[PDB]
Design a protein around this ligand. Structure first.
Ligand code: ANP
Ligand code: MG
Length: 345
């Protein structure tokens, strides 16, 4: 069984992969583990391989691994990364350590794209695909709540896929920091959420594509909340009453702001605005931003309305926007077997 597999060093990590997977090259990593590009000799094409090291290590890694494994196996949409293969090189439950996820190989994450000037055609198309993916997750009862540029990937042909399935419905001993900058006020302030929680994150990413700077940076949620109100202004009263009384006291009592206008937030400097085409697309991009970056989710644009926005709808395909389509608590030994049984079936 192990002669189905070979071992290569990739940084500090050892990848033990099926012999079909040749010429591994690191392309990224995070808390879950290391990601490599490989040639798949059987499919005759490049793939991405993510190694999860002992995902049953702790509740958080285990919940995420199990959830991600179940969801990318059963979810099928051009804007959600497809799982091509799943394996472990260990032969039994007792020996089981590592899960390798094999995906279609994309070229880059959105962090690299944010560093570029994109025309309106590419920006609107990327945003359209993000919205089609979110739509599809929402239609399957998945509200991500954790979209960020590092887990959205793109090809050279401007095709986009979401890598991950977001938060569950979490103490960890790592160096690894959670990126919070794209999290909605509903998540920052823990105040219940609907589908358009994910619109906030799209607005943060779009904002960043235009500014080339994180909109709402902060050491913690305190700083991040300051950065939100400093720019969009203190929200309205009906917003507050939706908050836990402890959070409510906190928000109700911060130094007030009227905030900045969308023209000052995203000046004409930041958009292609030479041609009449680009002038009109700049005003439409700023409009859509003004509707996504809305603190109060009652007043924030929905996924469906965002897809109908003039900046986006030039791409709109019913095939892509319409297609039909866990949370428990175990010990590390139970998670190991649940994950093992999913990897084997
Ligand atoms: N299928 C893939 N194709 C191309 N690059 C990928 C692929 N999967 C991951 N990457 C790259 O590897 C980086 C890290 O992968 P990622 O899966 O985000 O690990 P993570 O951020 O630790 N876990 P998670 O955020 O929950 O998905 C991503 O930002 C991409 O740059
Ligand atoms: Mg990620």
């Amino acid at each position: 069984v192990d002669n189905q597999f070979y071992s290569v060093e990739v940084g500090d990590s050892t990848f033990t992969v099926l012999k079909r997977y040749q010429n591994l090259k690191p392309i990224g990593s995070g808390a879950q583990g290391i990601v490599c590009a490989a040639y798949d000799a059987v499919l005759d094409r490049n793939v991405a391989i993510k190694k999860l090291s002992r995902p049953f290590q702790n509740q958080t890694h285990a919940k995420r691994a199990y959830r991600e494994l179940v969801l990318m196996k059963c979810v099928n949409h051009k804007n959600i990364i497809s799982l091509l293969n799943v394996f472990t090189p260990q032969k039994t439950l007792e020996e089981f350590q590592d899960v390798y996820l094999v995906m279609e190989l994309m070229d880059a994450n959105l962090c690299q794209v944010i560093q570029m000037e994109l025309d309106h055609e590419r920006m609107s198309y990327l945003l359209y695909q993000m919205l089609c993916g979110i739509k599809h997750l929402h239609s399957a009862g998945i509200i991500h709540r954790d979209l960020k540029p590092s887990n959205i990937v793109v090809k050279s042909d401007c095709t986009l896929k979401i890598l991950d399935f977001g938060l569950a419905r979490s103490f960890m001993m790592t160096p690894y920091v959670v990126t919070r900058y794209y999290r909605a006020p509903e998540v920052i302030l823990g105040m219940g959420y609907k589908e358009n929680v994910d619109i906030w994150s799209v607005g943060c990413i779009m904002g960043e594509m235009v500014r080339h700077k994180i909109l709402f940076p902060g050491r913690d949620y305190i700083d991040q909340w300051n950065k939100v109100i400093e720019q969009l202004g203190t929200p309205c009263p009906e917003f507050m009453k939706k908050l836990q009384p402890t959070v409510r006291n906190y928000v109700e009592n911060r130094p007030k702001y009227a905030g900045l206008t969308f023209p000052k937030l995203f000046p004409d400097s930041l958009f292609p605005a030479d041609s009449e085409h680009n002038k009109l697309k700049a005003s439409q991009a700023r409009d859509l931003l003004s509707k996504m970056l809305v603190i109060d989710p009652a007043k924030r644009i929905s996924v469906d309305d965002a897809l109908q926005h003039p900046y986006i709808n030039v791409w709109y395909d019913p095939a892509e926007v319409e297609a039909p389509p866990d949370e428990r608590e175990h010990t590390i030994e139970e998670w190991k077997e649940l994950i093992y049984k999913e990897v084997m079936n």
